[PDB]
């Protein structure tokens, strides 16, 4: 595919494939050109070299790429390793309907609720907002609802408060050691840009308010909304599974 400025961005798989094709063609041309053995036997070995470097580059001689000195990535290299497929693709992927922010205090909050910034909720629940607006006779069609929320009309704030109502969300702390690293809370719309967190849970999350950031995740299916209320909700996880001692104990 092309890119900005006109430069084209290609994959190393291409370079390697092109090499295999060039050398196979050259060999056939020799086989029909009546060449000696010292030439054709060199071509066969070059072909084997190119093919093996195309399947797995780094087991024969590490065929480098073009203008760049770095060795090009072969087929098998696009599967294994912590980076790439199977580890950074199929077990862990990025997800829509999510976000992150710097977290703060929030004592007034209950052990089950958390303060979620308003604009974050707007952007997150955009798909819910559009439909719930076009349903209540406030937006002609989906496109009109988009412009209504894009203009920040007053009615859409109350609409957002109607969609949040009992719709649990998921909060995650960056290193996830135990299962409590992800816990479901009940959204509490708030002004500003900071995420309010309940102090009693700071122990379980193992987080401070020195600049730590947390990520939010919005469930979609009615199931994921129930599992966030009867399985992941904060007030359902009190005593740790590792040891019967409660994970919810007063801090400083």
């Amino acid at each position: 595919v092309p890119l900005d400025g006109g430069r084209f961005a290609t994959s190393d798989l291409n370079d390697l494939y092109r090499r295999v094709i060039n050398r196979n063609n050259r060999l056939k041309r020799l086989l029909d050109l009546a060449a000696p053995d010292i030439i054709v036997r060199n071509e066969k070995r070059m072909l084997q070299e190119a093919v093996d470097a195309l399947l797995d580059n780094g087991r024969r001689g590490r065929a480098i790429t073009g203008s760049n000195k770095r060795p090009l990535k072969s087929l098998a290299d696009m599967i294994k390793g912590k980076q790439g497929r199977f580890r950074q693709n199929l077990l862990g992927k990025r997800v829509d309907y999510s976000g992150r922010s710097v977290i703060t205090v929030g004592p007034y909050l209950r052990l089950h609720q958390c303060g979620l910034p308003k604009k974050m909720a707007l952007e997150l629940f955009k798909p819910f907002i559009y439909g719930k607006l076009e349903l209540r006779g406030l937006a002609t069609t989906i496109k009109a609802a988009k412009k209504m929320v894009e203009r920040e009309e007053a009615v859409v704030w109350d609409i957002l408060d109607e969609v949040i109502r009992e719709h649990p969300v998921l909060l995650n702390r960056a290193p996830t050691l135990h299962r409590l690293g992800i816990q479901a809370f009940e959204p509490v719309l708030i002004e500003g840009k900071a995420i309010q967190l309940h102090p009693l849970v700071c122990a379980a999350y193992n987080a401070d308010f020195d600049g730590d950031q947390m990520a939010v995740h919005v469930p979609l299916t009615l199931e994921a909304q129930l599992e966030a209320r009867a399985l992941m909700m904060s007030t359902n996880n009190i005593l740790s599974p590792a040891n019967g001692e409660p994970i919810i104990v007063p801090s400083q």
Binding site: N42, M46, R60
Partner: peptide, 10 residues
């Protein structure tokens, strides 16, 4: 050596 360039160079 291993590399097939050595097979040819010699």
């Amino acid at each position: 050596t291993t590399d097939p360039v050595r097979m040819y160079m010699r």
